[PDB]
Amino acid sequence: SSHPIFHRGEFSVCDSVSVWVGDKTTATDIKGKEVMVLGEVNINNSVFKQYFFETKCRDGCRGIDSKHWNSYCTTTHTFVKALTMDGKQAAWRFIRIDTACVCVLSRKA
Amino acid sequence: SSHPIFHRGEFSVCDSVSVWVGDKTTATDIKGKEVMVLGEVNINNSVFKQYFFETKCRDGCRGIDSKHWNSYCTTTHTFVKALTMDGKQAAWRFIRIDTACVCVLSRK
Amino acid sequence: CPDACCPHGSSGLRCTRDGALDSLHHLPGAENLTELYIENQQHLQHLELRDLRGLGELRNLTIVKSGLRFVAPDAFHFTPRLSRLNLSFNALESLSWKTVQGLSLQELVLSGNPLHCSCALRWLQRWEEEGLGGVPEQKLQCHGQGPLAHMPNASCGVPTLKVQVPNASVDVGDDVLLRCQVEGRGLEQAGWILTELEQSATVMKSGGLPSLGLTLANVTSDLNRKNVTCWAENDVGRAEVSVQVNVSFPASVQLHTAVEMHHWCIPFSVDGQPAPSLRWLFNGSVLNETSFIFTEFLEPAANETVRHGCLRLNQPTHVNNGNYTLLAANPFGQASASIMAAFMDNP
Amino acid sequence: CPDACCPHGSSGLRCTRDGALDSLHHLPGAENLTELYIENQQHLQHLELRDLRGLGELRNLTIVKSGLRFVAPDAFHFTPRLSRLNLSFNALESLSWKTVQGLSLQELVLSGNPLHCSCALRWLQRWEEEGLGGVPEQKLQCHGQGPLAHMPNASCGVPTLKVQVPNASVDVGDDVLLRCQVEGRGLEQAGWILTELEQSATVMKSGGLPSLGLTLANVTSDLNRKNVTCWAENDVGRAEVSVQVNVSFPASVQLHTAVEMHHWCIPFSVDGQPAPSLRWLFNGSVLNETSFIFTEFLEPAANETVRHGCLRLNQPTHVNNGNYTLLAANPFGQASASIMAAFMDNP
Numbered sequence: 001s002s003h004p005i006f007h008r009g010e011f012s013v014c015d016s017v018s019v020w021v022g023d024k025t026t027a028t029d030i031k032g033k034e035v036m037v038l039g040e041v042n043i044n045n046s047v048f049k050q051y052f053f054e055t056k057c058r059d060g061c062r063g064i065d066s067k068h069w070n071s072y073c074t075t076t077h078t079f080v081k082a083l084t085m086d087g088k089q090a091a092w093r094f095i096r097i098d099t100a101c102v103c104v105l106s107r108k109a
Numbered sequence: 110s111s112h113p114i115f116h117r118g119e120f121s122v123c124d125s126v127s128v129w130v131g132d133k134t135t136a137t138d139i140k141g142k143e144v145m146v147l148g149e150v151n152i153n154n155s156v157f158k159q160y161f162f163e164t165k166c167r168d169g170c171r172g173i174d175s176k177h178w179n180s181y182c183t184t185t186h187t188f189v190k191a192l193t194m195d196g197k198q199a200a201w202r203f204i205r206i207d208t209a210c211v212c213v214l215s216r217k
Numbered sequence: 218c219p220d221a222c223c224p225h226g227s228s229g230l231r232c233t234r235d236g237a238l239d240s241l242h243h244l245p246g247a248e249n250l251t252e253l254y255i256e257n258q259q260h261l262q263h264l265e266l267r268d269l270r271g272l273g274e275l276r277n278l279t280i281v282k283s284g285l286r287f288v289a290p291d292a293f294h295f296t297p298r299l300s301r302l303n304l305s306f307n308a309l310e311s312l313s314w315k316t317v318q319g320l321s322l323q324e325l326v327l328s329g330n331p332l333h334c335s336c337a338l339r340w341l342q343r344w345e346e347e348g349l350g351g352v353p354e355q356k357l358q359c360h361g362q363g364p365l366a367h368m369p370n371a372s373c374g375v376p377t378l379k380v381q382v383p384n385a386s387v388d389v390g391d392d393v394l395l396r397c398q399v400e401g402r403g404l405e406q407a408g409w410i411l412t413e414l415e416q417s418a419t420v421m422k423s424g425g426l427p428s429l430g431l432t433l434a435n436v437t438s439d440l441n442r443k444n445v446t447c448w449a450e451n452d453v454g455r456a457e458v459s460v461q462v463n464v465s466f467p468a469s470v471q472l473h474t475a476v477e478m479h480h481w482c483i484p485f486s487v488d489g490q491p492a493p494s495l496r497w498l499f500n501g502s503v504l505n506e507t508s509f510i511f512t513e514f515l516e517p518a519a520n521e522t523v524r525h526g527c528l529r530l531n532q533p534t535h536v537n538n539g540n541y542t543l544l545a546a547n548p549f550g551q552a553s554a555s556i557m558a559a560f561m562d563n564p
Numbered sequence: 565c566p567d568a569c570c571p572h573g574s575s576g577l578r579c580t581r582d583g584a585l586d587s588l589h590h591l592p593g594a595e596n597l598t599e600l601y602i603e604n605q606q607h608l609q610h611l612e613l614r615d616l617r618g619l620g621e622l623r624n625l626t627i628v629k630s631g632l633r634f635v636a637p638d639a640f641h642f643t644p645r646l647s648r649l650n651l652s653f654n655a656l657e658s659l660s661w662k663t664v665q666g667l668s669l670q671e672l673v674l675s676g677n678p679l680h681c682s683c684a685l686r687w688l689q690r691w692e693e694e695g696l697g698g699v700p701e702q703k704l705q706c707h708g709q710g711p712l713a714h715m716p717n718a719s720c721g722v723p724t725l726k727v728q729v730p731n732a733s734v735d736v737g738d739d740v741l742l743r744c745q746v747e748g749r750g751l752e753q754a755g756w757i758l759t760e761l762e763q764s765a766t767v768m769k770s771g772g773l774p775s776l777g778l779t780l781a782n783v784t785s786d787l788n789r790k791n792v793t794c795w796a797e798n799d800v801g802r803a804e805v806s807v808q809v810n811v812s813f814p815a816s817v818q819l820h821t822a823v824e825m826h827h828w829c830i831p832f833s834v835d836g837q838p839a840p841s842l843r844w845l846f847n848g849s850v851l852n853e854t855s856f857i858f859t860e861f862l863e864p865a866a867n868e869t870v871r872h873g874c875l876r877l878n879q880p881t882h883v884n885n886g887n888y889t890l891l892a893a894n895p896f897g898q899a900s901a902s903i904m905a906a907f908m909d910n911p
């Protein structure tokens with residue numbers, strides 16, 4: 001840990017972790033409604049296991065001027081198409097999934 | 110107008126902008142290979158024109174302690190599945206798209 | 218000067234010898250000074266405001282060695298600062314409470330003094346435990362003797378304080394009468410404090426000492442969020458308690474054009490008392506708040522009934538584009554405000 | 565004292581009159597002083613360092629009105645500071661350059677002086693244009709007269725300098741010999757400057773004035789990035805020029821555990837002279853860098869051939885998990901280092 005980079009490197013303000021999520025069963029759609037997420041999908045005769053690339057906060061932010069600001073890191077989302085279920089309606093709908101971790105700024109005093 | 114929120118609300122260190130991209134024709138796959146994106150796809154029925162939700166940096170960062178840190182905002186990505194032409198055949202592959210705008214720190 | 222005083226050198230008037238104040242106010246030499254040494258003096262029995270009649274900027278006052286038996290709760294009224302006051306080796310039977318009156322007095326010597334322990338000394342008592350005026354180290358005790366910085370404790374108390382507001386809610390242009398009942402066994406002065414009640418006609422003096430009448434006539438709404446306090450001073454300390462009015466007026470509401478911060482926000486401002494209940498409508502139909510679309514209030518400001526906040530949208534899409542109506546309701550009816558918001562285009 | 569000097573008040577020695585320094589060095593009273601006023605005397609012709617024999621912190625020195633005419637490059641050598649030097653109204657024909665030797669002198673008065681304009685005043689020339697020592701306003705002019713702060717300009721210059729490195733490359737344990745050619749007309753002193761060559765055996769004195777010979781024998785790699793400079797001083801000014809050596813040795817290389825920061829990074833450190841060309845392998849095969857996976861060098865540190873950096877990976881997935889190999893190559897051959905990196909568990 002004596003490498004210069006541990007000092008002169010480019011750092012994140014908020015630390016994240018990225019994983020493949022494949023056990024997702026529920027999610028909320030573009031309308032904010034809780035919908036069911038299937039585990040496989042049929043894209044042109046080819047059965048696919050539904051997987052998602054998700055990034056979330058690694059559970060105040062780094063480099064912030066704490067004299068003047070309260071702050072914290074938080075997980076933000078993206079909308080991605082997915083085979084879901086609303087009744088006997090299997091559909092190709094956009095759902096909400098973790099995609100980044102950003103710093104939320106807040107003035108103090 | 111002057112509303113208390115412009116002072117007491119929760120702001121971003123970096124400003125972004127979300128849009129819906131439906132004219133994407135190329136993208137890079139997970140192998141970093143450049144691939145062709147189908148304008149449409151179809152599930153055992155009619156066709157869904159392929160659209161993507163993207164967020165990039167909106168034209169240093171806010172609230173940074175400029176005494177010890179340099180900083181800049183930059184667009185990060187995410188991997189999303191998509192109907193692509195691998196340079197040989199049609200396939201469901203993960204492509205790289207803009208997904209957020211974050212702050213990058215560098216010591217002074 | 219010199220003749221019976223003023224040696225020292227710097228900012229100092231030194232007369233450690235004998236009475237000579239009978240003419241130290243007419244032609245002393247310099248109204249200013251900073252230290253006065255009056256250790257040792259036959260006369261000078263009652264120290265009063267008339268004895269320090271000389272607007273000074275003194276920090277050290279020594280009145281040890283003298284007759285000084287009484288010190289009218291006033292004396293040090295002239296000298297604003299005062300950090301050290303030495304009244305030791307004297308003939309003081311007690312030191313009134315007011316006496317000090319927060320002078321940031323850093324050192325207070327009350328010694329070799331008769332010092333008969335009354336309730337009126339609990340303050341001294343406290344200054345000890347609190348360890349404040351630099352009392353502790355002196356080992357003060359009680360005259361006649363029931364000896365010291367020990368002492369019956371709970372039998373001594375400040376006064377008790379209740380203020381009965383009217384039973385019934387209030388509406389603008391009413392009268393509101395109320396009483397301040399002080400119960401204790403000290404018993405000295407009393408009086409209400411009105412912190413700027415320009416918006417109403419007040420009428421007090423409606424009482425003596427068991428109860429203090431106060432009435433606010435032809436009450437406006439600008440009575441809201443305004444402390445109405447009452448006094449009390451017993452033979453050792455003071456208690457003041459303060460209530461509020463709450464007068465009622467109709468809801469008012471306004472929306473501001475949606476803006477994008479960390480989350481999107483439709484800024485709102487609402488007034489009314491009772492405070493209105495908020496309700497949103499999206500395109501004329503009720504909007505159910507969820508963890509992504511919810512109403513949020515900022516911290517309430519002091520002395521105001523008006524509330525500020527946001528309809529908060531966590532990454533809304535074109536599907537959230539539309540007309541947002543905020544409904545504010547209280548017992549007088551309902552106020553309404555609407556706004557068009559577009560967070561995203563929608564092919 | 566008093567007798568002919570020492571009045572003033574603060575750290576001042578004032579003798580505005582005839583010279584009497586003969587005993588102002590043996591038993592003056594205080595070697596300390598800050599202002600010296602000698603704007604009047606009968607002697608004082610040759611001012612040398614001896615005339616100032618006496619450690620002191622002087623900021624103002626007045627030697628106007630006197631007789632001085634020859635001030636050898638040394639004088640004020642003692643007073644390290646000195647901000648204002650007034651030598652006006654004298655006999656000084658010319659003032660040697662080296663005199664000031666960057667003493668931060670803020671004000672320099674030279675005037676009513678014969679001031680024969682020479683090349684040996686191009687320095688005051690500069691000082692006037694550059695507007696440095698508060699020369700401008702004085703309106704100095706030449707003695708005999710070819711009048712002033714005008715003056716043939718191109719006919720005065722500093723000496724020229726080239727230093728010839730061995731034309732052929734070098735390898736460790738060789739003899740590196742070289743000459744420093746100073747070409748001009750003023751012609752005074754010369755001499756190399758070695759910035760610590762503790763790792764090599766230097767051999768100088770091999771030159772006179774037209775050339776200065778310097779040879780390093782049995783040369784270690786610790787010669788790299790160590791400035792080798794040489795002097796030059798004409799009758800008016802100084803020029804130093806410096807070159808370097810570059811001794812070659814084989815490539816060395818190491819990789820560190822991959823670390824996730826903003827971007828993932830496989831840190832690396834590589835040395836070698838000549839500096840090696842780099843190439844990466846992923847699982848034994850060529851890895852072609854992209855906009856998302858590329859090599860990035862940190863800024864090279866002071867005098868050290870070693871380079872540090874990272875193979876930067878912009879949001880790599882499990883498909884990037886594997887063995888990463890860095891290959892450092894130069895004339896001597898090639899060094900290699902490998903490391904396994906896991907960025908994400910696979911499905």
Ligand SMILES: *[C@@H]1O[C@H](CO)[C@@H](O[C@H]2O[C@H](CO)[C@@H](O[C@@H]3O[C@H](CO)[C@@H](O)[C@H](O)[C@@H]3O)[C@H](O)[C@H]2NC(C)=O)[C@H](O)[C@H]1NC(C)=O
Pocket residue numbers: 461462463490491492517
């Ligand atoms: C006089 O009018 C006041 C203004 O409408 C009213 O305010 C109070 O309302 C309730 C009373 O129980 C309380 O509000 C709570 O505050 C806590 C935090 O302090 C919250 O966690 C909770 O959700 C709720 O908001 C407060 O006591 C106070 N709130 C305000 C508006 O500041 C009084 O109730 C009312 N009293 C009289 C004399 O009728």
Ligand SMILES: *[C@@H]1O[C@H](CO)[C@@H](O[C@H]2O[C@H](CO)[C@@H](O[C@@H]3O[C@H](CO)[C@@H](O)[C@H](O)[C@@H]3O)[C@H](O)[C@H]2NC(C)=O)[C@H](O)[C@H]1NC(C)=O
Pocket residue numbers: 809810838839
């Ligand atoms: C003898 O030692 C030299 C030390 O000064 C050294 O020179 C080299 O300097 C750097 C690497 O150390 C490189 O220069 C490049 O220059 C280009 C154009 O300015 C830049 O775009 C690039 O980033 C880099 O700075 C070269 O490797 C080399 N520079 C030269 C002289 O071309 C060498 O080891 C050697 N130099 C000689 C005399 O050949």
Ligand SMILES: *[C@@H]1O[C@H](CO)[C@@H](O[C@H]2O[C@H](CO)[C@@H](O[C@@H]3O[C@H](CO)[C@@H](O)[C@H](O)[C@@H]3O)[C@H](O)[C@H]2NC(C)=O)[C@H](O)[C@H]1NC(C)=O
Pocket residue numbers: 848887888889902903904
């Ligand atoms: C990344 O790949 C490297 C080469 O493919 C590999 O380098 C070395 O791996 C091990 C030790 O780290 C050694 O391999 C052995 O070499 C002996 C001698 O030839 C053989 O008898 C034996 O069968 C085995 O191959 C070598 O030092 C070298 N590999 C070779 C043979 O080229 C790295 O180890 C690898 N990264 C890691 C550390 O997993």
Ligand SMILES: *[C@@H]1O[C@H](CO)[C@@H](O[C@H]2O[C@H](CO)[C@@H](O[C@H]3O[C@H](CO)[C@@H](O)[C@H](O)[C@@H]3O)[C@H](O)[C@H]2NC(C)=O)[C@H](O)[C@H]1NC(C)=O
Pocket residue numbers: 444459460461519
């Ligand atoms: C009349 O004057 C003020 C309002 O105009 C009120 O004051 C008080 O304000 C706060 C209440 O929000 C009191 O409590 C704060 O301090 C305590 C420390 O004892 C903390 O726990 C915390 O910070 C509380 O928020 C303060 O004690 C007091 N402020 C002052 C002047 O020091 C006052 O209450 C009001 N009269 C009443 C009771 O109606």
Ligand SMILES: *[C@@H]1O[C@H](CO)[C@@H](O[C@H]2O[C@H](CO)[C@@H](O[C@H]3O[C@H](CO)[C@@H](O)[C@H](O)[C@@H]3O)[C@H](O)[C@H]2NC(C)=O)[C@H](O)[C@H]1NC(C)=O
Pocket residue numbers: 791806807
């Ligand atoms: C021999 O001495 C030093 C090596 O130990 C060299 O130094 C240089 O340092 C940097 C170049 O890396 C430069 O610093 C000067 O320039 C900057 C930018 O213009 C200014 O901030 C300031 O004027 C710095 O002093 C110079 O190139 C040089 N520094 C100086 C002026 O000594 C040095 O270059 C080398 N000898 C030479 C001159 O070749």
Ligand SMILES: *[C@H]1O[C@H](CO)[C@@H](O[C@H]2O[C@H](CO)[C@@H](O[C@@H]3O[C@H](CO)[C@@H](O)[C@H](O)[C@@H]3O)[C@H](O)[C@H]2NC(C)=O)[C@H](O)[C@H]1NC(C)=O
Pocket residue numbers: 277278279281301302303304305326
């Ligand atoms: C007001 O008068 C007080 C008494 O006159 C004075 O108390 C102090 O008195 C002197 C300071 O001059 C000190 O006491 C000394 O004690 C030693 C024994 O240790 C004796 O030998 C000596 O003669 C003198 O009495 C103490 O500093 C203190 N007295 C004690 C011991 O409690 C107050 O300080 C004074 N108030 C002020 C600051 O104006």
Ligand SMILES: *[C@H]1O[C@H](CO)[C@@H](O[C@H]2O[C@H](CO)[C@@H](O[C@@H]3O[C@H](CO)[C@@H](O)[C@H](O)[C@@H]3O)[C@H](O)[C@H]2NC(C)=O)[C@H](O)[C@H]1NC(C)=O
Pocket residue numbers: 500501540541542555556557
């Ligand atoms: C989003 O929908 C709102 C409807 O709730 C709309 O409110 C207003 O709409 C119009 C223009 O402001 C007005 O509507 C009136 O409706 C009465 C009903 O009897 C008619 O008689 C009258 O002629 C008029 O059409 C009102 O100002 C108001 N509607 C009411 C009464 O609630 C918002 O305007 C709309 N978004 C926006 C700001 O365009």
Ligand SMILES: *[C@H]1O[C@H](CO)[C@@H](O[C@H]2O[C@H](CO)[C@@H](O[C@@H]3O[C@H](CO)[C@@H](O)[C@H](O)[C@@H]3O)[C@H](O)[C@H]2NC(C)=O)[C@H](O)[C@H]1NC(C)=O
Pocket residue numbers: 603624626628648650652673
């Ligand atoms: C070093 O000694 C210099 C000689 O005494 C001195 O020169 C200056 O002397 C006074 C300073 O107050 C000024 O003289 C002027 O003379 C003109 C001509 O009559 C007057 O019109 C004007 O009112 C003023 O008296 C000048 O500033 C200057 N005079 C000259 C050329 O000798 C230097 O100032 C002194 N260096 C320092 C420490 O500043």
Ligand SMILES: *[C@H]1O[C@H](CO)[C@@H](O[C@H]2O[C@H](CO)[C@@H](O[C@H]3O[C@H](CO)[C@@H](O)[C@H](O)[C@@H]3O)[C@H](O)[C@H]2NC(C)=O)[C@H](O)[C@H]1NC(C)=O
Pocket residue numbers: 252276277300301
């Ligand atoms: C009234 O008179 C003075 C008003 O400023 C004060 O006195 C004191 O001043 C300082 C306070 O710590 C102390 O003096 C010592 O320090 C000074 C400063 O270095 C020195 O001259 C020397 O060491 C002094 O002994 C003393 O506490 C006291 N001054 C003295 C020695 O008379 C103070 O506010 C009050 N005087 C008192 C103590 O009654």
Ligand SMILES: *[C@H]1O[C@H](CO)[C@@H](O[C@H]2O[C@H](CO)[C@@H](O[C@H]3O[C@H](CO)[C@@H](O)[C@H](O)[C@@H]3O)[C@H](O)[C@H]2NC(C)=O)[C@H](O)[C@H]1NC(C)=O
Pocket residue numbers: 598599623624625648
């Ligand atoms: C050399 O000795 C002293 C310097 O160590 C000189 O002194 C003076 O110093 C400055 C100028 O150098 C004078 O001016 C100060 O005050 C002005 C206010 O008008 C400000 O602009 C600023 O603070 C300046 O620094 C001082 O007035 C004076 N010092 C004193 C005694 O206060 C001294 O003049 C010089 N001797 C000579 C004449 O050779």
Ligand SMILES: *[C@@H]1O[C@H](CO)[C@@H](O[C@H]2O[C@H](CO)[C@@H](O)[C@H](O)[C@H]2NC(C)=O)[C@H](O)[C@H]1NC(C)=O
Pocket residue numbers: 370371373
């Ligand atoms: C009376 O003086 C005592 C000092 O002993 C104060 O301390 C209290 O400490 C405890 C509080 O939890 C209890 O022991 C008592 O309340 C009290 N101590 C006793 C026995 O007196 C106390 O605050 C003082 N009481 C008053 C007048 O406030």
Ligand SMILES: *[C@@H]1O[C@H](CO)[C@@H](O[C@H]2O[C@H](CO)[C@@H](O)[C@H](O)[C@H]2NC(C)=O)[C@H](O)[C@H]1NC(C)=O
Pocket residue numbers: 693694717718719720721
């Ligand atoms: C000789 O005098 C000339 C007079 O111009 C000097 O030229 C410089 O003049 C300015 C400096 O005060 C600047 O404009 C430049 O540094 C330079 N003029 C240009 C732009 O060429 C010159 O430096 C002096 N020294 C010699 C002999 O070169």
